[PDB]
Specification:
part of a larger assembly; 11 chains; A mainly alpha; B mainly alpha; C alpha+beta; D mainly alpha; E mainly alpha; F mainly alpha; G mainly alpha; H mainly alpha; I mainly beta; J mainly alpha; K mainly alpha; F: two-stranded antiparallel sheet; 53% helix; globular; J: 1 helix; rod-shaped; binds chlorophyll A; binds ligand PL9; binds 1,2-distearoyl-monogalactosyl-diglyceride; binds ligand SQD; reaction center (chain D); transmembrane helix (chain D); Photosystem II reaction center protein K (chain D); plastid (chain D)
Chain lengths: 34, 35, 50, 37, 56, 334, 151, 59, 245, 30, 52
């Protein structure tokens, strides 16, 4: 009874809204066509 | 009542058709740049 | 596709159905243009509701 | 409820509709990373 | 203007060939004439007809 | 050289005193119809049974009103959203009894003010201007269509439209607060920020131009005679106004671009009035403002009141007293 | 020092105003995290096997035939509104009771035949076809007894 | 088994969400790496069909 | 009528047919049974006249002046039922239920609006004879209830069974020993019940449908507004229909 | 009787608006 | 009758006649400028300045 719903929701929120800035950070490091 | 309805229908279709065929009267060309 | 769904592939939910509202094959759609375009050319106001 | 083979992924499904809002925010991050030029 | 009349004849020839095919095919498919199929479709149904104009 | 082309050249002529245009072919007949019917109904119109319960409300000056209390009363609740022209009314006295003039004025006003908006596009096109003055006028047009058309549509009756009167307007505001809690709606809050900010920015921009006017007059003549109509030079020191406002708050918070500044003067009230017009249009379908009644609760479970609860006691006083004979059942679902 | 509950993890959690305690406040398992109800197992007070539920559905099926039999008395008159109202006033509970009693695969296809004839009765009543209502009303009755004669 | 395959499809999709636009928006990497990315596209498409098979078989 | 029952609700609505009475076809006779009962009595007024002193050519006789209805098509009573009692010689009708009242407002020449509750409430109507005939005459008195109930609030918030009992916007009138006695008639809302008189007259009887129908003439008093104005006499004429069983 | 004053003030206000529009001082350059 | 479902509010054929006659009258004036206009004359702008 470790309440995995808010653990699951806040981790899946954090993975998802870091995946977008991860694309732009990686393209800034690769010096891509931004 | 129904004589007034003929008069209003005649009046509305007069001004709406002036609006319609006026904006069909090559209205983009009526600008001060050309024509 | 909506016509195919309602007439052949399962039907659509008809809240007006006899017996209670249910899924129903629409077998006789209204094809009369006076009825059909009578919705398009009626008043938008109360009782008419375009 | 999701079907029984998929109720493990129920917290992931809770964030999936918000992802279109994250796409509008992504266009502002990309414009800021290029410097708005 | 005579060659325009020849073109008006030919374009009406090709159009009415398609038109008389549809008349022949609808008269078989409906069983009635075309004024009798159009006039029944350009009229309101008898269950749909408003009773109408009972306001004194 | 044809008759229609000579009529088209006159209609779209920029040498008329007032521009007519093709939107004026809808603007001038509808608005003069609504003006003629408004003046006659405001001065002399018999009392209107607004709530459908055969309790007629006097609205005109000849039936004992003044300028403040006088109104063109909305249509009967028995009519609802039904179209009520004169020719559907069997006598003009029946049309006047059932609030007929309200539907005539409102529908001709809303058509005519939409055509006023298109006329504002049209003259800008014939003058070679940029087009979007009429987009700014769309914010008061959306507000007029919300309280006269959209809110009747959602509530299902022209009787719930805003009355064409001063005291009828305040009756419209109070009943709207009791039934929808518009003060706690954030779209009215953005509208208040639109008109408080807009009159702030009007007084701000008007101050800084008047503060930084260049010497062109003497102490005897008016200061406004330092501007000549048609002059090419700037009439005020915008560097001095930017240096003032940049020291009043801090430097980075002031517009040095006059084009960006005047765009901000256009955007703030117009977006604010657009949002509050979509507050009225969404409270038309009873998506009401925030309800925080009995939301603060102590440990035992008892309700601790807040300022929203005292606001709720004033909403309760309007709603138990509004339309006091019209209700038969314990919920005002209309 | 006030009562704290970070969502369910840190603090009390089983307090009267904690909103993100999904099932951690109560002992019995919920249907879902997004529910306030326990599932549809046993310990539930609703028993779908019970005799008063079956008898309510059978009483709908019996009175349906009584309402279905006064249809042609509206069709030797021409009260077409009474035909359409009879098929929807009492008979609104018929589709709910017939599909609840249709368990086997032949019950379901014998039930839709009654449903098709019921919609033929209704559609002929809007079209005011007098012989077609009665020709559908006997088919609706004859398919109704065929469903009830199964069980 | 379905829960194992969808969890693999989520991980492959999360890898393709952050690597496909990087490969397309650096101006040479897609034509030098698309055999590797079409291979992941086919494992992605084949996972959907195997899940659709296992879901329909179990129903 | 059989014709009206052939129609849908969607064919009738908006048309104004729902405010009309059915017409009866034929001259026949119906003899009511001991358990007989009128069931769907429609009563449609077609003329309205309010009594007022008028100045015709040189004098000031009392005339019923024809007035125009402003409450549009809400005036027809319908679904009136009640038993038909057969006395020794005569046949009587006691109405019990149904929509036996309709609030109507007529306008007089001059702009004067006369609201009145057109009603047949508690009608006991005595006939001549024992069967319904094309010359049969039924008539009797009814009770007109007050147009506003005691729950009705006036513009100042005063009513009979609810409301203020004082002119609350003039608080200094409650001063001295006389108080607001000059405003007593406006502060005292009184429920008044007056009498009306209807005279029906059958002229068409359909025996196969058991339907009668003819004309009527009725007189009653108008709204008193809880005893604040003097009521006017309203004469109405029109058509009725009933089914006899 | 005060409605005579109310009508005269409103009609008098509209007459000022008429003269302000059609009898305005025309803005002129030079 | 106002709540009945009539096309453009036409319940009498008088109203249909004045709708046609009103719309055809401005059409006939408009055809005085745009009748006798060539159908095959095109342009490749966003706007045409053809004739009067
Ligand atoms: C001029 C336009 C026109 C119009 C309005 C119609 C209208 C119709 N056609 Mg016709 N048809 C036309 C031209 C037209 N047709 C032409 C030019 C041809 C030759 C290609 C046909 C060949 C044709 C066939 C073979 C059939 C129709 C049929 C129909 C009817 C279909 C019924 C429905 O509600 O949909 C409808 C009256 C059907 C019909 O008559 O059903 C009774 C039908 O079977 N049409
Ligand atoms: C600018 C002109 C104008 C317009 C637009 C209106 C509009 C209106 N008037 Mg007003 N009126 C006007 C001037 C105008 N008025 C003037 C000058 C007078 C003094 C004579 C009046 C006197 C007057 C009175 C006394 C009344 C009105 C009323 C009305 C309303 C309904 C009238 C009606 O039913 O017409 C008929 C309208 C039509 C037949 C519609 C024509 C539109 C066409 C068909 C466009 C449709 C295109 C179509 C969809 C395209 C499909 C094509 C596709 C199928 C291929 C309407 C809001 C009534 C009212 O206010 O009710 C409350 C009313 O009682 N008017
Ligand atoms: C006592 C002073 C006072 C203050 C500070 C406010 C403030 C406010 N009122 Mg209130 N109000 C007041 C008196 C006041 N009011 C009075 C006397 C009345 C009549 C009785 C009202 C009636 C009223 C209504 C009906 C409403 C408000 C609303 C508001 C809010 C937005 C209004 C707005 O944007 O205006 C225009 C102002 C600007 C465009 C300038 C911005 C001002 C902000 C607050 C300054 C921010 C500074 C920032 C934090 C500093 C950062 C930079 C820093 C590093 C230097 C704002 C919180 C609205 C609301 O409730 O919103 C939630 C609303 O609906 N007011
Ligand atoms: C100090 C407190 C305060 C403030 C600043 C506001 C501010 C506002 N209120 Mg709010 N309100 C308040 C308290 C407040 N309210 C309270 C306490 C209540 C509860 C009683 C309300 C209940 C309430 C309601 C119900 C409504 C508002 C609305 C509004 C907005 C009205 C402005 C507008 O939209 O006009 C826009 C302009 C117009 C409507 C006029 C249009 C002009 C037309 C197009 C042309 C007119 C020409 C004319 C006929 C002729 C001209 C003259 C001629 C000679 C040329 C404004 C944001 C209204 C709103 O938000 O509507 C969107 C609204 O409906 N309020
Ligand atoms: C890879 C292809 C594929 C696809 C698309 C499906 C899809 C489906 N199968 Mg499965 N199936 C598959 C492979 C597939 N299966 C395999 C390999 C096997 C083993 C042989 C099975 C064995 C199987 C069985 C035994 C059953 C299914 C069933 C189903 C349906 C499940 C829901 C339902 O009850 O139907 C009801 C119908 C729907 C829910 C309609 C869903 C489609 C709607 C219209 C959405 C589509 C919208 C549109 C395309 C999306 C936009 C796209 C884009 C262009 C913008 C669903 C349509 C069930 C079924 O078919 O029931 C009749 C079922 O009993 N499948
Ligand atoms: C030693 C000890 C004991 C220690 C104790 C510590 C201690 C001393 C602490 C004290 C610290 C303390 C609080 C000091 C800080 C001072 C401080 C800021 C206090 C005030 C408090 C407070 C929160 C103030 C905030 C109020 C504030 C500044 C609001 C303004 C917000 C703001 C950005 C407004 C801008 C609005 C705006 C954009 C308007 C412009 C629009 C407009 C029409 C402009 C017109 C215009 C502009 C032009 O530009 C030009 C050109 C022209 C033509 C022109 O028309
Ligand atoms: C986005 C903006 C919002 C869009 C508004 C949406 C419009 C709603 C759709 C309207 C339905 C259209 C059906 C036809 C109209 C209709 O039947 O009304 C016809 C209705 C019916 O009229 C009434 O009908 C009743 C029967 O139900 C009775 O018979 C009444 O006597 C009769 O008056 O009358 C009106 O609403 C009058 C319309 C007046 C229109 C004039 C204004 C138009 C000016 C615009 C300029 C034209 C350019 C647009 C041309 C394209
Ligand atoms: C954490 C949350 C993250 C949120 C992410 C974002 C969410 C969506 C926000 C949308 C922001 C869009 C930016 C648009 C920029 C733009 O407007 O440029 C237009 C000009 C260009 O600026 C001018 O720009 C010029 C340079 S250039 O044009 O940009 O090239 C320059 O010359 C000039 O000095 C300068 O003023 O901007 C200005 O004139 C200043 C006005 C800025 C106002 C926009 C703020 C938001 C609206 C105000 C409030 C609404 C009113 C309602 C209140 C009741
Ligand atoms: C009032 C009712 C009258 C309408 C009658 C309805 C019949 C319609 C006409 C049918 C035949 C016309 C021949 C008449 C002869 C005639 O004179 O026509 C004339 C007409 C146009 O020719 P004109 O010379 O008048 O001018 C044409 C232009 O060049 C402008 O000048 O041609 C057509 O419209 C024929 C189109 C055939 C279309 C048939 C193909 C349809 C198949 C579906 C296509 C699939 C598309 C997918 C892509 C692969
Ligand atoms: C010198 C001398 O002596 O004589 C001279 C002078 C003279 C007399 C003037 C002559 C001439 C000129 C003539 C005879 C000209 C033409 C005569 C004629 C008869 C021309 C019909 C065309 C019909 C068409 C195109 C039909 C399309 C019909 C179509 C496309 C349809 O869809 C059919 C339809 O049923 C449906 C299927 C569906 C409906 O929805 C629509 C309708 C109802 C339409 C001569 C003989 O040439 C020479
Ligand atoms: C379906 C699915 C999926 C997919 C999804 C995804 C993953 C998507 C993406 C997502 C995204 C798409 C995201 C994005 C995000 C974004 C963000 C988070 C942003 C934000 C930011 C902020 C807000 C900031 C901003 C700024 C800047 C930068 C500067 C200037 C200023 C400002 C403040 C404006 C997965 C794989 C999971 C798997 C499962 C299922
Ligand atoms: O109309 Mn004007 O206010 Ca809307 O809620 Mn219901 O209805 Mn009446 O009451 Mn409340």
């Amino acid at each position: 009874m470790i309440n995995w719903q808010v653990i699951g929701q806040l981790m899946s929120t954090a993975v998802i809204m870091l995946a977008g800035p991860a694309v732009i950070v990686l393209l800034a490091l690769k010096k891509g066509n931004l | 009542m129904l004589t007034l309805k003929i008069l209003v229908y005649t009046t509305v279709i007069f001004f709406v058709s002036l609006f319609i065929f006026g904006f069909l009267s090559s209205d983009p060309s009526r600008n001060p740049n050309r024509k | 596709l909506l016509v195919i769904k309602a007439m052949y592939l399962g039907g659509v939910y008809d809240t007006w159905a006899p017996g209670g509202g249910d899924v129903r094959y629409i077998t006789t759609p209204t094809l009369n243009p006076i009825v059909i375009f009578g919705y398009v050319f009626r008043s938008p106001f109360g009782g008419d509701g375009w | 409820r999701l079907p029984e083979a998929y109720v493990v992924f129920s917290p992931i499904v809770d964030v999936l509709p918000i992802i279109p809002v994250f796409f509008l925010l992504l266009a502002f991050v990309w414009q800021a990373a290029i410097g708005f030029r | 203007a005579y060659e325009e009349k020849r073109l008006q004849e030919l374009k009406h020839c090709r159009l009415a060939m398609i038109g008389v095919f549809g008349l022949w095919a609808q008269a078989q498919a409906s069983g009635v004439g075309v004024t009798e199929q159009i006039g029944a479709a350009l009229t309101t149904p008898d269950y749909y007809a408003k009773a109408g104009y009972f306001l004194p | 050289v044809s008759l229609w082309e000579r009529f088209c050249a006159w209609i779209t002529s920029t040498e008329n005193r007032l521009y007519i245009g093709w939107f004026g072919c809808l603007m001038f007949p509808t608005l003069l119809t609504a003006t003629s019917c408004f003046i006659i109904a405001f001065i002399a119109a018999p009392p209107v049974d607004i709530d459908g319960i055969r309790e007629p409300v006097a609205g005109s000056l000849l039936y004992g009103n003044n300028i403040i209390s006088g109104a063109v009363v909305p249509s009967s609740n028995a009519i609802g959203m039904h179209f009520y022209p004169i020719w559907e009314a069997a006598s003009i006295d029946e049309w006047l009894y059932n609030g007929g003039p309200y539907q005539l004025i409102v529908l001709h006003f809303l058509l005519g003010v939409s055509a006023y908006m298109g006329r504002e596009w049209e003259l800008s096109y014939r003058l070679g201007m940029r087009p979007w003055i009429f987009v700014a006028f769309s914010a008061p047009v959306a507000a007029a269509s919300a309280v006269f058309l959209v809110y009747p549509i959602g509530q299902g009756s022209f009787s719930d439209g805003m009355p064409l009167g001063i005291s009828g307007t305040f009756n419209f505001m109070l009943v709207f607060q009791a039934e929808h809690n518009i003060l706690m709606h954030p779209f009215h809050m953005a509208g208040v920020a639109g008109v408080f900010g807009g009159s702030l920015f009007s007084a701000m921009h008007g101050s800084l131009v008047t503060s930084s006017l260049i010497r062109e007059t003497t102490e005897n003549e008016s200061t406004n005679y330092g501007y000549k109509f048609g002059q090419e030079e700037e009439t005020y020191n915008i560097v001095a106004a930017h240096g003032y406002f940049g020291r009043l708050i801090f430097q980075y918070a002031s517009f040095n671009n006059s084009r960006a500044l005047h765009f901000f003067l256009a955007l703030w009230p117009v977006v604010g009035i657009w949002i509050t017009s979509m507050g009225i249009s969404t409270m038309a379908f009873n998506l009401n403002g925030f309800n925080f009644n009995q939301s603060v609760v102590d440990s035992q479970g008892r309700v601790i009141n807040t300022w929203a609860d005292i606001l709720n006691r004033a909403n309760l006083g309007i709603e138990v007293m509004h339309e006091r004979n019209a209700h038969n059942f314990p919920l005002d679902l209309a | 020092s006030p009562r704290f509950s970070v969502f369910g993890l840190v603090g009390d959690g089983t307090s009267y105003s904690e909103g993100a305690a999904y099932g951690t406040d109560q002992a019995d398992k919920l249907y879902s995290p997004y529910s306030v109800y326990s599932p549809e197992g046993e310990k539930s007070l609703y028993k779908p096997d019970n005799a008063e539920y079956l008898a309510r559905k059978k009483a709908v099926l019996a009175e349906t035939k009584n309402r279905l039999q006064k249809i042609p008395a509206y069709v030797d008159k021409k009260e077409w509104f009474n035909v359409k109202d009879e098929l929807t006033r009492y008979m609104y509970e018929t589709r709910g009771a017939v599909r609840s009693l249709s368990s086997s695969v032949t019950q379901k296809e014998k039930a839709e035949v009654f449903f098709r004839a019921l919609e033929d009765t209704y559609g002929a009543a809007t079209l005011k076809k007098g012989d077609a209502v009665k020709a559908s009303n006997d088919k609706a009755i004859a398919a109704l007894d065929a469903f009830t004669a199964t069980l | 088994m379905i829960t194992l395959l969808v969890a693999l499809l989520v991980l492959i999709s999360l890898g393709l969400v952050v690597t496909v636009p990087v490969a397309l928006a650096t101006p040479g990497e897609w034509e030098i790496a698309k055999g590797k990315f079409n291979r992941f596209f086919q494992i992605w498409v084949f996972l959907v069909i195997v899940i659709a098979a296992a879901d329909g078989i179990s129903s | 009528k059989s014709q009206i029952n052939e129609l849908s609700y969607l064919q009738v609505k908006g048309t104004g047919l729902a405010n009309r009475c059915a017409e009866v076809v034929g001259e026949d006779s119906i003899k009511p049974k001991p358990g007989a009962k009128l069931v769907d009595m429609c009563i449609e007024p077609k003329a309205w006249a309010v009594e007022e002193e008028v100045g015709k050519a040189g004098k000031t006789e009392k005339k019923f002046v024809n007035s125009k209805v402003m409450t549009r098509q809400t005036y027809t009573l319908d679904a009136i039922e009640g038993p038909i009692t057969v006395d020794g010689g005569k046949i009587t009708f006691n109405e019990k239920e149904g929509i036996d009242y309709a609030a109507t407002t007529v306008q007089l020449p001059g702009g004067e609006r006369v609201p009145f509750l057109f009603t047949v409430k508690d009608l006991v109507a005595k006939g001549n004879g024992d069967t319904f005939k094309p010359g049969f005459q039924m008539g009797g008195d009814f009770n007109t209830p007050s147009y506003r109930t005691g729950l009705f609030l006036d513009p100042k918030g005063r009513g009979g069974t609810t409301g203020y009992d004082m002119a609350v916007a003039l608080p200094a009138l409650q001063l001295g020993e006389e108080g607001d006695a000059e405003l007593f008639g406006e502060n005292n809302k009184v429920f008044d019940i007056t009498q009306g008189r209807i005279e029906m007259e059958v002229n068409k009887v359909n025996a196969e449908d058991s339907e009668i129908g003819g004309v009527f003439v009725a007189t009653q008093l108008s709204d008193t507004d809880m005893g604040s104005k003097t009521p006017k006499k309203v004469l109405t004429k029109g058509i009725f229909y009933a089914k006899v069983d | 009787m005060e409605a005579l004053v109310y009508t005269f003030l409103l009609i008098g206000t509209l007459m000022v608006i008429f003269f302000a529009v059609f009898f305005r001082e025309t803005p002129r350059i030079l | 009758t106002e709540g009945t479902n009539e096309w453009f509010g036409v319940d009498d054929l008088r109203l249909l006649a004045v709708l046609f006659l009103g719309h055809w009258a401005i059409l006939s004036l408009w055809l005085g400028s745009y009748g006798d206009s060539n159908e095959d004359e095109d342009f490749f702008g966003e706007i045409d300045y053809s004739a009067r």
